[PDB]
Amino acid sequence: QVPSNCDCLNGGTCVSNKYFSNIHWCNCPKKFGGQHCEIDKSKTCYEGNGHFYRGKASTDTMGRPCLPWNSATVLQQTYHAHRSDALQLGLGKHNYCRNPDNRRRPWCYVQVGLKPLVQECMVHDCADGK
């Protein structure tokens, strides 16, 4: 143990609070990591929660390409390319995943056997799949 009101690496930043007796925290870049932030990683596949998102992730949390919002199936669902608020998320002619409702990760109407179920399009990891 090394009570130093902080502990990072790779030249991290040793910070410490004083308005609560002791509320410090390793001050390392968000792209850092490694126990005490000893690596220059770069985790950030969605600065938001999935509201807009502008990457390439088009599959769901399984791998399927998910159904586009123009697939009559999703048209039968709710948030597709023919509801009334799809113009706010631009769902028509496109796929990826949208989260205009109440959810943390971006989901997409992906066919789940016989009913396009919204699945938080797994958007984790983003480095050549490795």
Ligand SMILES: *[C@@H]1O[C@@H](C)[C@@H](O)[C@@H](O)[C@@H]1O
């Ligand atoms: C910790 O403090 C911050 C403000 C930056 O100077 C970092 O480079 C440093 O490690």
